[PDB]
Ligand binder design. Structure first.
Ligand SMILES: CCCCO[C@]1(C(=O)O)C[C@H](O)[C@@H](NC(C)=O)[C@H]([C@H](O)[C@H](O)CO)O1
Ligand SMILES: [Ca+2]
Ligand SMILES: [Ca+2]
Ligand SMILES: [Ca+2]
Ligand SMILES: [Ca+2]
Ligand SMILES: [Cl-]
Ligand SMILES: [Cl-]
Ligand SMILES: [Cl-]
Ligand SMILES: [Cl-]
Ligand SMILES: [Cl-]
Ligand SMILES: [Cl-]
Ligand SMILES: [Cl-]
Ligand SMILES: [Cl-]
Ligand SMILES: [Cl-]
Lengths: 281, 264, 57, 234, 264, 57
């Protein structure tokens, strides 16, 4: 299937007036060149292959950067650097989020890929053996780790991936996991109805998707015990929507995001550059 | 004889006429319908109130002035206090509805102006504090039939507690997108030289078969002056805009005692 | 259970797919779907509008 | 060699993977199977079994056999006999039922819940009891006149000892979450005297009923997860 | 749906719409056409420039005032400097063309006035000296897209050299016949209460199959105010008249170097 | 969807190809194309020249 060919047409002198319409109807303009000019025949062999939803979304996009370290931790703050937890979302970054938000609703499977990098913190503390990482998916309700070596990492039921530093970026597929018939990119509502004369506080409650969304937690640790040399790591998380359906198109984000909602920032709401004149080529 | 400009709509005991229409929009080309057994979720026999609730309710009119920046409503919020529709909505945990939206604005052959009338699924709007995100009170999000107005200025509050309302900034459609692109949503235009009414028929739109109407608005209704009202003999003249909405194919599940939402 | 399909043409042509996993979520990208109906967005009108006829009669 | 190219995921250990692996004991002759009674195929078979709700887990009764029996008497109070939220995974009283324990290995649940009540007064005790399920979003019922507007059954005490009240599946979402969650709140179960318990002389004027919960055949769970009900020191 | 008032005309890359037409005239009931082999004269393979030249060219607008006596153009003279039509005309000894003439004049439901729009074959006009006859300069006869105006007075020059222009006397149609009889020529009327445009489709008209376009105008276009422009709030108001003309079925013979006519 | 083709001969003979990718751009080298027409460069003349005849008659 190809984009439209142009038919051979000459002029008209007619009560047929395809050049005029009334967009008050809610219909866009429909006229094509053959309606308003003399056209030659042009066979169009070109296709819209690369603008299908699968093609538009068919890329692994970085959605977050996590940090973990491996060293002899003697304080609470340093113990908390030995592992990290991240609420799974696409809202830490802007590029994939903006593409998804052309649509109100979506349904897709997810390919998740990880890029893991290390550096030495210092040069005077000897060396470090090759590190193994555990990335544990903690679904809502499953116990979250409070230490890098607590019981939760035995991961009897949670999916974990063990990654050996220097090996191919680890990768797994996630089904469509939504509890609705599609994911909502926008939710015009609340998680509960506040009722007349209730004692529950209405002053610090939130609005929209943030009140209802929960895709669980990614927990990451270095499985190795500490070397004399402190190693600091970054874990880049990549998402690719696949087997994609989307509904109800939206205008794309025109101004910077300032969080997980649709809110905008007072110093960043002037996207257009003023032209010198309405007559500027 | 039959004309794109002349239309009658009857639902229940209510009829609308227009002699200066511009066709009618059926959002996404889909007429509303009842929920099929093969797409159903809650298993209790639903209430289908039919003519008691599936009828035209006329909201309080608003005044279009040369200085108006626009108006918004949410659905089903705008109809929550409307006759038996409101009672069925609040006596049930779950509800679904389509709508016929009829926006009315007549003037004269000497007036000029154009209203964009947009039906927006999941019309999420920005909050009015930069101390927080997604920080809107239930009461400010759900104004009912009075709806709200757009502004051409964004003045977020000093204190988080004072900014728990929408920053309904007209040119960003109150949600960080350019208003010029609102035409991707089901719409008509009331251009005073052409037409005096807009008609949008809306199917139920959601990621679910049925949902909590008291928690969740499925549609926003936005009326934006695309071209300002002008009238040479009196630039300060006002003409009413009247919004009349009929629920359609309403279905409710999970009957219990009545929901009475907070008012402060 | 090999699927043989047409490749996307290059400069100048079938390819083979076998699914290795028991979950469809594991599968490679969906096949090109050229489906479209712009009219649900560009012309969602109740009464048919013929381009050559007046929009408002 | 056959030209190959390693893809992302190569060499990872995903704990939910499903691959073949070499056998450490090749050619091993397993013990022949025999028929054993009580074979289980599905955890939802276990979820359909009645287990007792620790409905009276109040101070001094929690973590004793007295946490189970629901106090009844012949005084005909207008106050509710018991009140509990339809939160079968997360509620302090439902989480430790057999159904609650199974739900805490899953993230999502759907379907109808069956509440069966056994009256354990004397044969000479009579009474009518209202059992109600109110889907959420309205004032939680604390009076019979609010409770009776919801899904309910009037139980006449008699020769048939037990009465079943259903919490039919009535939800916005297709699944609820196995956590305390406003968005997937399930509503309110309450119980009132419809008349009162009446006894003749020489008969106990206070007595108990037992409440059981089980899943219906429309019930299913998904998204396996670790439970918060078992842990160990490290 | 289809109306005598609503028309689209497409030629080449150009389209005209009108929503207040009054049908269209086909002069002498004959659509233009190419020259048949059985009526041909010059034997060289002709140039048929088609869409490059057979398209709408819009002339400079003129202002209709309560005091205007009318306007004239000649064809192909009015189009001699118009894009590729002008180039094809001047690179060839011989040319033939039909035309779509579209005259545009909108006002309001409160304005009144009527323009006669006449297509006149061989529109020969009187000279402005009584010392000579047939005494008109090429430059004054061929003003191009600016055309000329009628007068309600005849003031022939004292000196023959000063009178080498047309005596465009309105009531004698600039040629010694009564203007009231101009309706024998293909025409429409723009009556402001009825219509805002006139459309005339003209075949090639001549005593020859093909002729020297730089020597000879086949058609005159005359616009006469039959009823004066009147507007009660401002009797001195002006409304534009815009003339848009498309050559049709153009054919040229006798290619050589370009013709550059005298300008003084 | 295996293709079996003749190998290029060595010192002293089919081989098998399966395409693994959905894009023809991913494919290995095009098969040997022995097409040629040197005359479009060596003899691009309007009138046929017979070698045995005079080039200019
Ligand atoms: C002698 C100068 C020490 O330089 C280095 C090091 O060779 O050790 C460089 C190293 O890149 C830096 N690490 C970072 C993350 O900046 C490290 C660190 O500051 C210090 O050893 C402990 O604070 O000092
Ligand atoms: Ca084509
Ligand atoms: Ca049209
Ligand atoms: Ca055409
Ligand atoms: Ca030779
Ligand atoms: Cl471990
Ligand atoms: Cl170790
Ligand atoms: Cl500029
Ligand atoms: Cl009112
Ligand atoms: Cl209201
Ligand atoms: Cl309140
Ligand atoms: Cl001009
Ligand atoms: Cl000119
Ligand atoms: Cl000269």
């Amino acid at each position: 299937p190809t984009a439209q060919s142009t038919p051979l047409t000459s002029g008209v002198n007619s009560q047929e007036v395809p050049a005029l319409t009334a967009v008050e109807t809610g219909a866009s303009g429909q006229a094509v060149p053959s309606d308003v000019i003399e056209t030659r025949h042009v066979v169009n062999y070109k296709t819209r292959s690369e603008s299908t939803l699968e093609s538009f979304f068919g890329r692994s996009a970085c959605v977050t950067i996590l940090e973990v370290e491996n060293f002899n931790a003697t304080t609470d703050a340093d113990r908390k650097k030995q592992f990290t937890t991240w609420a799974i979302t696409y809202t830490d970054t802007v590029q994939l989020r903006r593409k998804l938000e052309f649509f109100t609703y979506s349904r897709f499977d997810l390919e998740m890929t990880f890029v893991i990098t290390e550096r030495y913190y210092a040069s005077n503390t000897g060396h470090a053996r090759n590190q193994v990482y555990q990335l544990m998916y903690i679904p809502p309700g499953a116990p979250r780790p409070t230490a890098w070596d607590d019981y939760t990492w035995q991961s009897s039921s949670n999916p974990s991936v063990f990654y050996t530093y220097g090996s191919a970026p680890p990768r797994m597929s996630i089904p469509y996991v939504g509890i609705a018939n599609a994911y909502s990119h926008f939710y015009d509502g609340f998680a509960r109805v506040p009722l007349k004369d209730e004692t529950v506080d209405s002053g610090d409650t939130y609005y929209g998707l943030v009140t209802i969304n929960d895709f669980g937690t990614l927990a990451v640790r270095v499985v190795n015990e500490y070397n004399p040399a402190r190693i600091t790591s970054k874990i880049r998380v990549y998402m690719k929507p696949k087997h994609v359906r989307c509904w109800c198109p939206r205008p794309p984000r025109a101004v910077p995001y300032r969080g997980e909602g649709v809110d905008f920032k007072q110093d960043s709401i002037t996207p257009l550059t003023a032209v010198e004149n309405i007559n500027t080529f | 004889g039959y004309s794109d400009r002349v239309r009658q709509i009857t639902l229940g005991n209510s009829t609308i006429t227009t002699q200066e229409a511009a066709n009618a929009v059926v959002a996404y080309g889909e007429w509303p319908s009842y929920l099929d057994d093969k797409e159903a979720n809650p298993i209790d026999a639903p209430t289908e109130p039919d003519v008691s609730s599936n009828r035209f309710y006329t909201l309080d009119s608003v005044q279009w002035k040369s200085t108006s920046r626009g108006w918004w409503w949410k659905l089903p919020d705008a109809l929550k206090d409307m006759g038996m529709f409101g009672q069925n909505m609040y006596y049930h945990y779950l509800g679904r509805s389509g709508y016929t939206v009829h926006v009315q604005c007549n003037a004269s052959k000497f007036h000029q102006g154009a209203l964009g009338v947009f039906a927006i699924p999941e019309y999420v709007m920005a909050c009015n504090t930069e101390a927080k995100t997604s920080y809107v009170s239930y009461v400010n999000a759900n104004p009912g039939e009075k709806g709200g107005v757009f502004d051409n200025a964004y003045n977020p509050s000093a204190e988080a507690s004072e900014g728990r309302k929408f920053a309904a900034l007209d040119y960003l459609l109150g949600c960080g997108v350019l208003a010029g692109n609102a035409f991707v949503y089901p719409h008509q235009i009331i251009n005073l030289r052409t037409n005096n009414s807009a008609t949008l028929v809306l199917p139920y739109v959601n990621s679910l078969a049925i949902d909590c109407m008291a928690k969740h608005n499925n549609w926003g209704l936005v009326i934006l002056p695309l071209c300002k009202l002008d009238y040479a003999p009196n630039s300060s003249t006002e003409i009413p805009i009247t919004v009349t909405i009929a629920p359609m194919f309403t279905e409710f599940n999970g009957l219990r005692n009545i929901t009475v939402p907070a008012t402060q | 259970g090999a699927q043989v399909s047409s490749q996307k043409v290059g400069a100048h042509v079938n390819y083979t797919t076998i699914n290795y996993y028991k979950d469809s979520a594991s599968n490679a990208a969906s096949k090109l779907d050229f489906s479209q109906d712009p009219s649900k967005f560009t012309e969602p009108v109740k009464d048919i509008m013929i381009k050559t006829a007046p929009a408002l009669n | 060699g056959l030209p190959t190219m390693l893809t992302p995921g190569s060499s990872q250990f995903l704990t939910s993977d499903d691959f073949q692996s070499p056998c450490a004991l090749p050619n091993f002759d397993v013990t022949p199977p025999i028929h054993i009674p009580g074979e289980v195929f599905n955890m939802m078979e276990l979820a359909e079994i009645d287990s007792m709700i620790p409905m009276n887990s109040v101070t001094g009764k929690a973590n004793t056999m007295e946490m189970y029996p629901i106090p009844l008497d012949d005084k005909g109070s207008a106050t509710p006999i018991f009140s509990i939220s339809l939160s079968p995974a997360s509620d302090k009283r439902l989480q430790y039922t057999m159904l609650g324990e199974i739900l805490n290995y899953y993230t999502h649940w759907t379907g109808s819940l069956r509440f069966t009540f056994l009256f354990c007064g004397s044969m000479m005790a009579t009474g009518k009891i209202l059992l109600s399920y109110s889907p959420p979003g309205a004032k939680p019922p604390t009076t019979r006149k609010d409770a009776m507007l919801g899904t309910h059954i009037i139980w006449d005490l008699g020769l048939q000892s037990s009465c079943t009240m259903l919490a039919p599946w009535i939800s916005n979402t297709v699944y609820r979450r196995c956590i305390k969650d406003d968005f997937t709140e399930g509503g309110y179960i309450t119980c009132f005297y419809q008349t009162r318990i009446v006894v003749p002389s020489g008969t106990p004027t206070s007595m108990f009923m037992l409440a059981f919960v089980s899943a219906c055949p429309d019930f299913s769970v998904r998204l396996l997860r670790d439970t918060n009900h078992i842990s160990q020191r490290t």
